[PDB]
Amino acid sequence: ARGPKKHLKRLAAPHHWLLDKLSGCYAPRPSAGPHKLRESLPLIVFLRNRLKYALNGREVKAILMQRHVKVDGKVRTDTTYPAGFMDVITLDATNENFRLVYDVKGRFAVHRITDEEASYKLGKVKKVQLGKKGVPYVVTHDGRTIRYPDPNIKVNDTVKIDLASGKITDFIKFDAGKLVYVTGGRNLGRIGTIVHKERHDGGFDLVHIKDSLDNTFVTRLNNVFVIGEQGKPYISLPKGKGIKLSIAEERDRRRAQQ
Amino acid sequence: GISRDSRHKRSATGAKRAQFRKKRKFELGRQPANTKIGAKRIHSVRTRGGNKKYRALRIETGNFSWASEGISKKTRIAGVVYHPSNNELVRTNTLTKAAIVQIDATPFRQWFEAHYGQTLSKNAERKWAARAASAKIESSVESQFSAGRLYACISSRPGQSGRCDGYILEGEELAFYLRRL
Amino acid sequence: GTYRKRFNEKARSGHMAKLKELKRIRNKQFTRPNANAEILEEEKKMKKRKLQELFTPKESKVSRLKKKRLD
Amino acid sequence: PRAPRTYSKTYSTPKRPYESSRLDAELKLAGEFGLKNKKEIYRISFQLSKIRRAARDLLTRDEKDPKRLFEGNALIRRLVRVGVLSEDKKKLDYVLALKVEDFLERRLQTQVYKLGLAKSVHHARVLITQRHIAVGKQIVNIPSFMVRLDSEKHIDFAPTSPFGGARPGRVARRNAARKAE
RNA sequence: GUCGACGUACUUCAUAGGAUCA
RNA sequence: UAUCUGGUUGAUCCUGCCAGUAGUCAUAUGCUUGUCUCAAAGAUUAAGCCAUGCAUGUCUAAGUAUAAGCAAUUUAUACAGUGAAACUGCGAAUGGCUCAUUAAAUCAGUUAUCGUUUAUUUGAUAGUUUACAUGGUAUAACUGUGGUAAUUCUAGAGCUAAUACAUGCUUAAAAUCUCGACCCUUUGGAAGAGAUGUAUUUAUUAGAUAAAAAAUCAAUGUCUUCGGACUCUUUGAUGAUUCAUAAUAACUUUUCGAAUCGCAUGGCCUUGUGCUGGCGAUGGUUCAUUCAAAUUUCUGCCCUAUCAACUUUCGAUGGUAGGAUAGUGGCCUACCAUGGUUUCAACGGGUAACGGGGAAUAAGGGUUCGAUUCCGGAGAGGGAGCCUGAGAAACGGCUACCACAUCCAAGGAAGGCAGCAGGCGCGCAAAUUACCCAAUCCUAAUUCAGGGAGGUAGUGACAAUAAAUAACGAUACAGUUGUAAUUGGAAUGAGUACAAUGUAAAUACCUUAACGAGGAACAAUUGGAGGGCAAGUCUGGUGCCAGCAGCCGCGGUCUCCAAUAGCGUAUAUUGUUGCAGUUAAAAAGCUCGUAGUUGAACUUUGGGCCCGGUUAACGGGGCCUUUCCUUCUGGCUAACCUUGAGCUCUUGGCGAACCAGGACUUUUACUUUGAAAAAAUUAGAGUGUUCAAAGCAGGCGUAUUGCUCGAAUAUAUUAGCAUGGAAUAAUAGAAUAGGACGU
Numbered sequence A: 001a002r003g004p005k006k007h008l009k010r011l012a013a014p015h016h017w018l019l020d021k022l023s024g025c026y027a028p029r030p031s032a033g034p035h036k037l038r039e040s041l042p043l044i045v046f047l048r049n050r051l052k053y054a055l056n057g058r059e060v061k062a063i064l065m066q067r068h069v070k071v072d073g074k075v076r077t078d079t080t081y082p083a084g085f086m087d088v089i090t091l092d093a094t095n096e097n098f099r100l101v102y103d104v105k106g107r108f109a110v111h112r113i114t115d116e117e118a119s120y121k122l123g124k125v126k127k128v129q130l131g132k133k134g135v136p137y138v139v140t141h142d143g144r145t146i147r148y149p150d151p152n153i154k155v156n157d158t159v160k161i162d163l164a165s166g167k168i169t170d171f172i173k174f175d176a177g178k179l180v181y182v183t184g185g186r187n188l189g190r191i192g193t194i195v196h197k198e199r200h201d202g203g204f205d206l207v208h209i210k211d212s213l214d215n216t217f218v219t220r221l222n223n224v225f226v227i228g229e230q231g232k233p234y235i236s237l238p239k240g241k242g243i244k245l246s247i248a249e250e251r252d253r254r255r256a257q258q
Numbered sequence B: 001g002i003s004r005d006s007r008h009k010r011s012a013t014g015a016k017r018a019q020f021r022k023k024r025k026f027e028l029g030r031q032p033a034n035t036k037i038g039a040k041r042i043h044s045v046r047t048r049g050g051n052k053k054y055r056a057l058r059i060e061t062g063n064f065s066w067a068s069e070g071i072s073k074k075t076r077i078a079g080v081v082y083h084p085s086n087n088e089l090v091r092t093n094t095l096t097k098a099a100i101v102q103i104d105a106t107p108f109r110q111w112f113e114a115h116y117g118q119t120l121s122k123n124a125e126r127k128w129a130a131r132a133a134s135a136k137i138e139s140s141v142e143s144q145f146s147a148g149r150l151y152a153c154i155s156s157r158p159g160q161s162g163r164c165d166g167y168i169l170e171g172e173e174l175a176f177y178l179r180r181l
Numbered sequence C: 001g002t003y004r005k006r007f008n009e010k011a012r013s014g015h016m017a018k019l020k021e022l023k024r025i026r027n028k029q030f031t032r033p034n035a036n037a038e039i040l041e042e043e044k045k046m047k048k049r050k051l052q053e054l055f056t057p058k059e060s061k062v063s064r065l066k067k068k069r070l071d
Numbered sequence D: 001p002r003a004p005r006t007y008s009k010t011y012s013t014p015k016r017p018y019e020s021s022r023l024d025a026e027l028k029l030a031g032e033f034g035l036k037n038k039k040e041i042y043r044i045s046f047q048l049s050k051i052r053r054a055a056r057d058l059l060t061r062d063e064k065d066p067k068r069l070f071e072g073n074a075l076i077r078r079l080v081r082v083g084v085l086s087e088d089k090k091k092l093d094y095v096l097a098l099k100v101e102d103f104l105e106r107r108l109q110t111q112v113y114k115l116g117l118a119k120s121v122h123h124a125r126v127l128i129t130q131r132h133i134a135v136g137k138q139i140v141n142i143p144s145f146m147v148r149l150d151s152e153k154h155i156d157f158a159p160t161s162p163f164g165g166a167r168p169g170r171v172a173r174r175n176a177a178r179k180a181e
Numbered sequence E: 001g002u003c004g005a006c007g008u009a010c011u012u013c014a015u016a017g018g019a020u021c022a
Numbered sequence F: 001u002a003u004c005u006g007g008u009u010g011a012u013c014c015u016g017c018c019a020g021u022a023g024u025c026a027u028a029u030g031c032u033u034g035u036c037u038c039a040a041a042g043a044u045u046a047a048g049c050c051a052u053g054c055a056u057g058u059c060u061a062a063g064u065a066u067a068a069g070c071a072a073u074u075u076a077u078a079c080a081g082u083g084a085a086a087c088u089g090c091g092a093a094u095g096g097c098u099c100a101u102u103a104a105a106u107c108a109g110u111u112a113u114c115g116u117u118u119a120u121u122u123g124a125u126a127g128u129u130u131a132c133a134u135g136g137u138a139u140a141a142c143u144g145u146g147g148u149a150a151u152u153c154u155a156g157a158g159c160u161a162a163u164a165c166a167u168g169c170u171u172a173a174a175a176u177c178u179c180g181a182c183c184c185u186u187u188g189g190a191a192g193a194g195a196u197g198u199a200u201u202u203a204u205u206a207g208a209u210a211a212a213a214a215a216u217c218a219a220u221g222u223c224u225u226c227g228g229a230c231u232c233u234u235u236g237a238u239g240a241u242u243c244a245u246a247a248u249a250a251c252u253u254u255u256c257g258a259a260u261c262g263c264a265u266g267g268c269c270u271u272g273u274g275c276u277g278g279c280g281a282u283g284g285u286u287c288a289u290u291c292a293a294a295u296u297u298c299u300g301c302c303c304u305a306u307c308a309a310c311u312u313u314c315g316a317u318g319g320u321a322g323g324a325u326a327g328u329g330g331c332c333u334a335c336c337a338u339g340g341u342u343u344c345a346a347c348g349g350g351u352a353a354c355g356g357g358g359a360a361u362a363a364g365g366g367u368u369c370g371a372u373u374c375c376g377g378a379g380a381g382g383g384a385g386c387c388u389g390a391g392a393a394a395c396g397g398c399u400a401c402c403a404c405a406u407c408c409a410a411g412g413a414a415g416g417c418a419g420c421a422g423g424c425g426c427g428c429a430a431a432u433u434a435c436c437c438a439a440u441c442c443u444a445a446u447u448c449a450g451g452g453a454g455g456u457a458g459u460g461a462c463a464a465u466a467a468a469u470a471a472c473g474a475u476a477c478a479g480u481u482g483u484a485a486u487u488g489g490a491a492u493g494a495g496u497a498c499a500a501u502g503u504a505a506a507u508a509c510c511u512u513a514a515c516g517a518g519g520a521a522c523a524a525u526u527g528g529a530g531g532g533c534a535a536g537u538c539u540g541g542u543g544c545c546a547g548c549a550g551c552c553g554c555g556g557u558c559u560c561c562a563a564u565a566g567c568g569u570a571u572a573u574u575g576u577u578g579c580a581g582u583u584a585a586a587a588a589g590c591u592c593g594u595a596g597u598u599g600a601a602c603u604u605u606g607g608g609c610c611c612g613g614u615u616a617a618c619g620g621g622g623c624c625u626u627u628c629c630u631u632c633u634g635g636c637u638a639a640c641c642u643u644g645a646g647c648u649c650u651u652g653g654c655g656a657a658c659c660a661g662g663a664c665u666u667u668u669a670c671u672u673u674g675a676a677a678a679a680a681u682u683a684g685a686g687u688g689u690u691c692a693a694a695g696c697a698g699g700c701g702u703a704u705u706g707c708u709c710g711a712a713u714a715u716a717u718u719a720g721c722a723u724g725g726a727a728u729a730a731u732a733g734a735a736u737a738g739g740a741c742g743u
């Protein structure tokens, strides 16, 4: 190619969007934004294919141009705005607030939240560095640059960002016994407690996570997101509480509830 | 014409590679800018991205730094005396990085006169007495000062930045280059 | 595929030139203007010599037999 | 272009079409169940082969193997639901013992014959293709329709059918009009 | 030239035996 | 091969042999071709040539309208509604097509940028720079005068705008650092004058630390109890940096720091068109993020040894310095050395070689195919070279040359279908030069415009699913069976068609008034096998016969078998597991010998206890047994001693184990487990698409408002990463001791 691509075939689109393979030939390409392409849910798919509010792309554009959709407390109008992990989607007319969280199956789940819990978000500190004029700043997983951080905040910590002011309200250190959420890999969507961090200089760090059912799994450190202390999450978790269930047990539960 | 691709070269084993593709713009090269002493002539070059480069086709002044005294003064370049890569640049008086040049000493000499009150208001006297301890300098630099032309080394790249900055040779640097001269 | 017979070599003469050069470099072991200008006999000779050298039909079967029998 | 739509063959030619015993068995099956051609028998043989191969593969695995348990339970459930496998025979061993005739039995043509709506299997086929038979509240015009245990009790003449309480067909009212005239 | 060698491709000849019976 | 059929003679058996009978896939071709769903369209190794048409343009309240544009209007004598043309900004580098070149190249997996650019999005970020606001250093559109046969050709003159072009001010305090008039000779002081944001270039400085105490020389600062005293004194990140950042001195054809636009008219008053003030758009330096780009580490490619040496003069390997690059780098230049690969197959040659996900077959190993729905690479007739722009070596951008080829008034001009349709390449052939942006998403100043991308329908049975062509009776005839141009009234869709549904508009599907069946002539096919007939014809002979065969005679103008809406014809279709080498393929005349492959045994075995797991067996851990890695530091602190209050608290010691880090360190092979290996595909769970192929849908209540489950799971070779094992196969150590340890 001679430049950046602007099209996305349906088959090449991220699996977890759950797009029909025969509805069309192309899929929404998320525009550049806070989140990466493969780890983002564009607003069109959220409003049309998940909430079923809009029947087709044109109605989604009609919704957005009315300025009813807010992402992280700011109005967005791009149909392909890449909403992602820990972003708050507010629809005032419906009096609805959503937080985008992966369910156990690894897909973004429609999770309804109260307004108070919608007042803030959580961000993984991706970088801590001194800016120009000797001003420290922190860059989070969603690309927010926050100046004058608390000095104790280090990389891989979690910061609770208030959306109204864009400032850090509190922070959680990455330590053993903390509650964490998996945001990548085959263990995507699971929740557990840290047990031990293996360090490999010049390589990818590994973290052992024990679930509430005492099952253990190892995951690369880049895919871990600290969300609180054990039993005291700082956000409301989706149904299932991040517990992975075997196929047989899922069958049993499904038959029972039916 | 000029290209920086590694494909046209032979492999490590000595095999003659075939032409994988046509030449690409992102691996281009441009003609050298044989900078020379004379009235200032600099023309811009639009490079990759929106960035810009400056081509020093002609130049006669440069900022030179005396490191020992930690000063930098602007001075005309007398000429090129010795270059390590190729002598033809010395014969043609072409300015490039690391070329050894001769520059006038008048600004540096005047600065040393003013700062130390020696030669190569009570406020001035007090300051001079305070700084008198550091007055002594190398004999080699002083001899050039007497001659009026100091030996300097260009640390900038005129073909890229459009500047001719440098620093005064000193110590082992000066001894070695004097031996080579 | 390097030197395979083409449908119309005469249409792609320049291509053949490259091939010849490659051969000259690859088989060497065995043997031993600016168009972007404001204003744009030896070159006629260059045209003739290059086009003739690139395009010479291989000496035919019956032609080999004829030379042998004439000898 | 648009993503592919999957397709598959539902039948395969037998290893030996020319065996006399096979020809006789095909004749017997076709006559008993009123099948149009050998393609139906080949289709049902293909399905039964697929199920029995799967049953073999699951049996090969160790007992209590989670894949074995899950897949065997699903297969036995499906076979029991469709009516081929009886309630008391819920073991993969008895799945492996199934025969083609059991599948031919569940066909809507055979069931329509057995329940007494038709005097012949061919009459049942004609009734089905003429939109006279309804499973539940729904008209089905496909003899190869496989009837489930729940659905077997709801086979009846369709409401729109002249035999199901609707108006007489074209022939009947045509003759009645001619007689009236 | 109904030429030699080789390569290639084909054709062809070699299948009945033991037991009983007349 | 297999089963079955037939031949092997004077016959019948038992062997053996021979001939024919298997297969889907692939190409070409023939005959037929009613309905529903669904879906594809390459091929002369010709990436050969193309007429005609279309396929990229774009405007919101928010850059520029005195169009002599339209329409309203005194809701405007600066404009304001809408708005052609043009300037300006953005896009045109996406998409679509093809597989020519390409054999460590591409590509797959896995790494790196502490080696670099990045329009845009997102978040931060700039009191340090006539102003009630500067120019033509200027023009388009437009008016008007013209040239040429001709083209998206344009010449002179006259005008006029900017978020175009080019300039240029306006805003707190403080601190610090220089130069310093002057009083004065002090321990000096000091009015004043300067400089500081960013951007570039260079030189220099800071960016500390395994842990504790003193004596002086020089400079020299706070303090007191005038003696001496002087404490809490500042520094982030990485495994690692000259990193982030800061500071000092200068430098620059040198930048940036809002002379822009919409909507609205709030608050203070000293009542001034005074001061102050909201919600947005668009610009702008730097940093980060995102979409990306470039290079890059390890492993992996078919045939060829009758290709054994290759690369190096004209860069091949490496060092140094420079040029260039966005940047590393022989990428190039100058000087240097003589290097680099190779029987573990380099180099050269062939490739009907784009690579992969995948497809076919097979019981397993394997073998073949993969132009072709997705990813990545390259190309736009063939070479070469460039403007623009963040992004191009672009070709529906430009320039030359090579080859073709169009117009021509002969002076000149214009070309690139391997985009969608549609032609030529033969004298023998095959989709429509159709409709639409309604769904998918993409582009723009942007909800609206545009989109042969894409969708819709049409068109050779590509490949696939379902499935009509009759069902129930009576009578008759013939040797309880078979046959009906016999006969009765019931059913129904192929088709026709009101209507409605469907669709952007249509067609079709599903529905459905009304028509639509006895030769149900509403007339099913493709192959094979076997008969019988004459005042007939040919041929041969131990009479009247036999073979061939028989649409033809004197006149006159038939039965059965197979598949089935599908059927036929032609070509094509090696042993690792695991082959053989005396007598019927193949052991070299013998020996030596390099590479390669292979290579005797031995090193902690056994025994005694403890714990908790499975279904008395089996596995999993701890100890003990001469068996514990070593060392330092840090963190917590058990147990162990003890006082006191009732095995639990508590006082003061001692602090094992465990955890964190620095030092200390034989290396692999093998094997276990965990991540990773896109989606699609394969297997596979659920789901009455009317069944099925499929799809990821759906399901349950319902007077009213609604509730709700899903879109699972498994597989993937080699390489790289992490981890448990210590059996098997290697590898290093103490021999002139240059060996181990130390309070």
Ligand SMILES: [Mg+2]
Residues within 6 Å of the ligand: A202, A203
């Ligand atoms: Mg790293």
Ligand SMILES: [Mg+2]
Residues within 6 Å of the ligand: D160
């Ligand atoms: Mg009906």
Ligand SMILES: [Mg+2]
Residues within 6 Å of the ligand: none
């Ligand atoms: Mg035909």
Ligand SMILES: [Mg+2]
Residues within 6 Å of the ligand: F034, F469
């Ligand atoms: Mg018909």
Ligand SMILES: [Mg+2]
Residues within 6 Å of the ligand: none
């Ligand atoms: Mg119909």
Ligand SMILES: [Mg+2]
Residues within 6 Å of the ligand: none
């Ligand atoms: Mg080759």
Ligand SMILES: [Mg+2]
Residues within 6 Å of the ligand: F104
């Ligand atoms: Mg490689």
Ligand SMILES: [Mg+2]
Residues within 6 Å of the ligand: F120
């Ligand atoms: Mg843009």
Ligand SMILES: [Mg+2]
Residues within 6 Å of the ligand: none
């Ligand atoms: Mg921005």
Ligand SMILES: [Mg+2]
Residues within 6 Å of the ligand: none
């Ligand atoms: Mg003019």
Ligand SMILES: [Mg+2]
Residues within 6 Å of the ligand: none
């Ligand atoms: Mg050289």
Ligand SMILES: [Mg+2]
Residues within 6 Å of the ligand: none
């Ligand atoms: Mg270098």
Ligand SMILES: [Mg+2]
Residues within 6 Å of the ligand: C001
């Ligand atoms: Mg090829």
Ligand SMILES: [Mg+2]
Residues within 6 Å of the ligand: none
């Ligand atoms: Mg291939």
Ligand SMILES: [Mg+2]
Residues within 6 Å of the ligand: F370
């Ligand atoms: Mg391919």
Ligand SMILES: [Mg+2]
Residues within 6 Å of the ligand: none
């Ligand atoms: Mg290209």
